[PDB]
């Protein structure tokens, strides 16, 4: 039913190498050249990628910031409330960002907070302003 293993005798390939007297060495060098093309291409991106690597030297260690470890509280100080209204104004609804900004209240409180202080801080009016941008 099928050829010996490793032998790759397609029904369609034989005709292509049998089509003409020099057809064999045609297809065989049509690929000899195509291989070179990819090799050429590999060097290029290997250079381009190598150049980009150099630019990233230093990584971002110098631009890194120490992490704050502050115990989440549950009381809203007048300050924290104010941080909040601004965070909504600049984030809109990204719960994590707003919790990250206050860095003491959490996403549940933050999420709760909109409904608690709702008419009081005009959050709906604020949120429209965020969506404008």
């Amino acid at each position: 039913r099928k050829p010996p293993k490793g032998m790759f005798l397609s029904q369609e390939d034989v005709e292509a190498v049998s089509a003409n007297a020099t057809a064999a060495t045609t297809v065989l060098r049509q690929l000899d050249m195509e291989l070179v093309s990819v090799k050429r291409q590999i060097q290029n991106i290997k250079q381009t990628n190598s150049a980009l690597k150099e630019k990233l030297d230093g990584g971002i260690e110098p631009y890194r910031l120490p992490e704050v470890i502050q115990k989440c509280n549950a009381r809203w100080t007048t300050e924290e409330q104010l941080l909040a209204v601004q965070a909504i104004r600049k984030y809109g609804r990204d719960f994590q960002a707003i919790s990250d900004v206050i860095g003491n209240k959490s996403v549940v409180q933050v999420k709760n907070f909109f409904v608690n202080y709702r008419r009081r801080f005009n959050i709906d009016e604020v949120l429209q302003e965020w969506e404008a941008e």
Binding site: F8, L28, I60, L65
Partner: protein, 665 residues
């Protein structure tokens, strides 16, 4: 083993009747399965009896005595079976002391052309049957293509050497009948390149398996893809080996392409991700600046100023989270690219060194078929491979010449008698022969039938070495051009000191180039005497016949010198170099299934010729011209046993037409 062993040893199914036997015994085959089994046993038995002692005639009575009941109840059937076996050379063939001596008065006159093994086999059989046999020989010796060189103790077959296995081989019988020094072949063959350095086991084994894998490939092309005709021409075997090597070479390239195309596909996933990392670092760089500027405003600050420091801090650690995720990913791609660079696929399908060694495997094929692989039929070249005898091929130590010479004991053999014209008519035949030494002395022979064992190369000769009157019908002449008669030659190197490995019978030499793959590519140590024997196969064969013995012998020493060191190669004492295509009594070595030919052409060769009626309106006559020889036996061509079987075959068919076949009632 048993009775059944004798059927196998006679090339016969032990449990079914052959088409042969259906012809002689149609009552049995069309009859009840019980009688068939009786018959079959009677046959299988009788075969046994002959085989266990093949040095004495097996008379019908002898058979009946040893046969037992209930099988020995129907004497006619036993007599019917034994005659059939005897007629067709399955028993009482070869060289045997006969119990009942030859009838003093013979019936019929048969001229046999050629004292080759087919010829003598028929001759012995016909004489055996009470016919008047005479063989006409062009040569001054019998055996034809069984030639043996002899000088002092030096002995080396220029002709056949090998008995291919005794499982079912009539030569098995002959060897018991004539003492034949039958020595086995140790298959181990070490290959030596042009430098004279042996090829290492790694390499030898890896190229041999490719070679077989390559054949297995051509078979697949022929049968499953039906790649048999190309450009309105039959596909040769060699053609399809090119097309298979090319396709395996293409695949090598294909897989290199696909593999590097999988590096570019990843280097470009890296380059695109590097871009994002470089654009994010700049964004981070300027964020930091903004945060520090925002952090520079010392407290106490109003909340919009506090929000800004917190907002910038949150954002910047967010981007520092992206750039960390995007450099874990860069690590994965960097290692993934590293794997791909280390697992590159095979550089080449085969190296120049590798493919030079591959050639030596094609030279072997060329030497087996005595022809360039471009002439072999793809579809049919191995058609005779089912009927291989079992057992390991042997060589004849005292020369193969002894068989032929032993078959000529008691035969009317005119040597130095070159047949030039065969004339065959409704009423009989006459063959015209000259004396080879003085071509003018002319001979006329009359006979009831001619058996022609002229080699196929002789028959192919234009202009004709032998003319037939009337000419052979085209159906015969066409099968003659269609068929292939090829070439291989031998060089016999005779030396006083054995300076090679005496425990290896054969060892190769890898030719420098493909076009010279068969020039002395194989050497044989077969003999008690110190003789190495060099083969010239493929294209080399036809070419080396235009070159001197000395020049040919030189290239022999050279190669031997290279594999053993200039020091240990003494000048050969006696040199003989065959030139079979040149020989006009052979004009070739043996037949091969040419492209465009088939196994049916051998069948064609063996159908005999019936001439036209002398007086128009007379009844359709008897056939008068019969053909034997290795080119007539489709299942066992180009072999001494095939020749022999064809002689046995025609003898029985000639006996049946002129002595009548009484075993059919």
């Amino acid at each position: 083993s048993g009775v059944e062993g004798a059927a196998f040893q006679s090339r016969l199914p032990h449990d079914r009747m052959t088409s042969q036997e259906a012809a002689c015994f149609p009552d049995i085959i069309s009859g009840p399965q019980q009688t068939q089994k009786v018959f079959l046993f009677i046959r299988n038995r009788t075969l046994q009896l002959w085989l266990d002692n093949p040095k004495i005639q097996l008379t019908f009575e002898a058979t009946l005595q040893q046969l037992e009941a209930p099988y020995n109840s129907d004497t006619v059937l036993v007599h019917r079976v034994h005659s059939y076996l005897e007629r067709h050379g399955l028993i009482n063939f070869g060289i045997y002391k006969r119990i009942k001596p030859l009838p003093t008065k013979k019936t019929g006159k048969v001229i046999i052309i050629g004292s080759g093994v087919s010829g003598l086999a028929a001759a012995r059989q016909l004489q055996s049957f009470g016919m008047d046999v005479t063989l006409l020989e062009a040569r001054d010796r019998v055996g034809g293509r069984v030639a043996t060189f002899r000088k002092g103790n030096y002995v080396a077959d220029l002709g056949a050497m090998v008995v291919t296995g005794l499982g079912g081989n009539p030569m098995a019988v002959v060897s018991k009948q004539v003492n034949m020094e039958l020595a086995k072949i140790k298959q181990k063959c070490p290959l030596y390149e042009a430098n004279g350095q042996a090829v290492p086991k790694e390499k030898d084994e890896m190229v041999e398996q490719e070679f077989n894998r390559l054949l297995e490939a051509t078979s697949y092309l022929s049968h499953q893809l039906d790649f048999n005709v190309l450009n309105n021409k039959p596909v040769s075997l060699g053609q399809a080996l090119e097309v298979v090597i090319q396709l395996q070479e293409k695949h090598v390239k294909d897989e290199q392409i696909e593999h590097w195309k999988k590096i570019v596909k990843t280097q470009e996933e890296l380059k695109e991700l590097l871009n994002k990392m470089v654009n994010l670092k700049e964004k981070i760089k300027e964020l930091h600046q903004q945060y520090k500027e925002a952090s520079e405003v010392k407290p106490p600050r109003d909340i919009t100023a506090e929000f800004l420091v917190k907002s910038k801090h949150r954002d910047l650690t967010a981007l520092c989270k992206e750039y960390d995720e995007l450099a874990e990913t860069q690590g994965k791609l960097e290692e993934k690219l590293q794997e791909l660079e280390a697992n590159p696929p095979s550089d080449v399908y085969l190296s120049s060194r590798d493919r030079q060694i591959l050639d030596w495997h094609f030279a072997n094929l060329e030497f087996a078929n005595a022809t360039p692989l471009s002439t072999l039929s793809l579809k049919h070249w191995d058609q005779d491979d089912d009927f291989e005898f079992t057992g390991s091929h042997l060589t004849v130590r005292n020369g193969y010449s002894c068989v032929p010479v032993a078959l000529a004991e008691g035969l009317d053999i005119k040597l130095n008698t070159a047949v030039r014209q065969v004339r065959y008519t409704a009423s009989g035949c006459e063959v015209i022969a000259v004396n080879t030494r003085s071509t003018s002395q002319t001979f006329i022979y009359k006979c009831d039938a001619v058996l022609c064992t002229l080699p196929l190369g002789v028959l192919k000769q234009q202009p004709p070495a032998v003319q037939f009157v009337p000419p052979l019908p085209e159906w015969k002449t066409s099968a003659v051009q269609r068929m292939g008669f090829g070439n291989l030659n031998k060089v016999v190197l005779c030396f006083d000191r054995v300076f090679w490995d005496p425990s290896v019978n054969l060892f190769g030499h890898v030719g420098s180039t493909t076009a010279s793959r068969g020039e002395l590519f194989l050497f044989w140590n077969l003999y008690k005497a110190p003789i190495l024997l060099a083969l010239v196969a493929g294209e080399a064969a036809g070419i080396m016949e235009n070159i001197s013995d000395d020049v040919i012998v030189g290239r022999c020493l050279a190669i031997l010198k290279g594999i053993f060191g200039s020091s240990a190669v003494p000048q050969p004492k006696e040199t003989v170099v065959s030139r079979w295509r040149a020989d006009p009594w052979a004009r070739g070595s043996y037949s091969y299934v040419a492209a465009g030919s088939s196994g049916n052409d051998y069948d064609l060769m063996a159908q005999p010729i019936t001439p036209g009626p002398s007086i128009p309106g007379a009844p359709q006559p008897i056939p008068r011209l019969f053909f034997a020889g290795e080119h007539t036996i489709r299942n066992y061509p180009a072999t001494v046993h095939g020749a022999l079987l064809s002689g046995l075959r025609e003898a029985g068919r000639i006996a049946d037409q002129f002595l009548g076949a009484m075993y059919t009632l």
